[PDB]
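Co-fold these.
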Amino acid sequence: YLMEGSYNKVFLAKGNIPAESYTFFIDILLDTIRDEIAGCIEKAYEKILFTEATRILFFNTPKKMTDYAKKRGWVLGPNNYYSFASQQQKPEDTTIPSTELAKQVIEYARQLEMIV
Amino acid sequence: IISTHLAKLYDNLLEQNLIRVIEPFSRVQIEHISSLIKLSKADVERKLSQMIL
Amino acid sequence: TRPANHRQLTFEEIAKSAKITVNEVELLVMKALSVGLVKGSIDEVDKRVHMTWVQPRVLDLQQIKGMKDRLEFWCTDVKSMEMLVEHQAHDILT
Amino acid sequence: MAKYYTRITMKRMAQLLDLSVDESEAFLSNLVVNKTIFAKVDRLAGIINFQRPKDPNNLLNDWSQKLNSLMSLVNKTTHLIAKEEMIHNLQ
Amino acid sequence: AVQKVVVHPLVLLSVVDHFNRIGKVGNQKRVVGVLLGSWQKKVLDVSNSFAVPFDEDDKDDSVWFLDHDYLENMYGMFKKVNARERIVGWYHTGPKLHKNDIAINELMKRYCPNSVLVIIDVKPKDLGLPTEAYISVEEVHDDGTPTSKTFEHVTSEIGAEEAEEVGVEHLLRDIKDTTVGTLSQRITNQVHGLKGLNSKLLDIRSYLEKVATGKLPINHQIIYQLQDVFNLLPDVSLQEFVKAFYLKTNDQMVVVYLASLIRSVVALHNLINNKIANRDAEKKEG
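Predicted complex below.
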């Protein structure tokens, strides 16, 4: 269930611990899910108010959200998570091909004319 | 025989003016091409649809 | 004055730099293209002009320093891309 | 206006002709079915444009023209400098 | 006025042997001689030459001599022994464009109207073509003098001929770059001409030696072209110059992908043509 996106069925299994306590393992399983949603809050989202993504992990309203809102972006504002979905700087590269391909074109001519 | 052959010639000259006035441009309204042929809009729109088919 | 990156000024900037209204700068630049002092193109709806060529002027002993340093790192670029060719196609002809 | 403009509005051209915007369209109609001035007009944004084909191939073709004009010019100065040093420090 | 010049390798060689014959002076001598040829169809032709006696003293270097009787009779012999041949101008050995060559051309223009000169090389090291030629133009013009006259280079190349192509290709018999395939262009102008552009970038670097320290005349008519070069520097990589470049790589390589696909099948048909001659003889011959 951790392999696919399913998170709620994971914590339905945190309502289902049958054998022994499993306490220290699911509490590490808390922490590796805490940064994961703090990782997956960083996708291309819109404004989220301070209720919706406030409760996607577990929490009601502690200052733990500011511990995540100042760790990454999505700036603390008027009931808002600000979206920095720019993804604009990297394209329009002729140069990165023009170094690599000029290598490759001569590499074509090596095993084309010179007998090996 | 002319009374038989006029109706088939009318269709050919209908689309011959219809590519003439439609030629000089890009996206355009349907309300003007009916206004520039002096003809209706529903029949022209079906006849326009036959061209792209 | 503008670099070769854009050199694409707007009509409002001419309305600032020549304090003349909007409805006369098009009459101005059509004269400038007709005489032959500038060679460019004119947009009207985005309010910009793509100037391409300007008349060559004179310059003192300071603008040659601009042509000194802008020319100097173009030396090593001719060096660097050729250095592949004498190294990668070296056995193709000795 | 086809030669020196790229994209003008329909209202702007009719004002330099001092006549109706429909009368402007009848003028540009019988010239491009005459195909002596090419134009691609619009009747929703009023945005016409001059000498605007799709240009698949002429980009790199006109770019290759600018190389040869450049390379013919860098050969012009080179054999013009080396004589200019010979009229001050010859002997 | 003149499109271009055409030089044979004979007259190219017919200066070098004279440069050997006066090489025993040691101190200083430029080879100056009469250039013969026949310009037709607005194309300058050069066929034959000799050299005229010529000396030069360094103090007051405006004193030249052309023994015109040697110019009269030997051309009269050459007009006799080849009436197709005539005068075309003159030449000099041309290391570095000596000063007397402003009026040598004006001394002997009463024979040839467009008395062209030719600058050659005696110590060959370059990456270009080591034959240079100018032309005579004069001006009562922009700023310099009331009487102004400056030479202008008309383009130059070594013409061949069906008679002499037999000779030079027998006379080479040396290291050669024949069999023009995928590789001759790589070395005649991709290894070489990129370094050919070096000495032209570095040539205008040499005029640049006057920023505050060099020679006293400054610019006026040198920078109109240099202002243009950074202006006519090509388009940046943002437009469909990016996109239409990937477009044609996506077209030119498809032809290579077809042509290389053919190359594998052809040699495979050759492979069976050796397996027909391997197995069908070991039982037959042994």
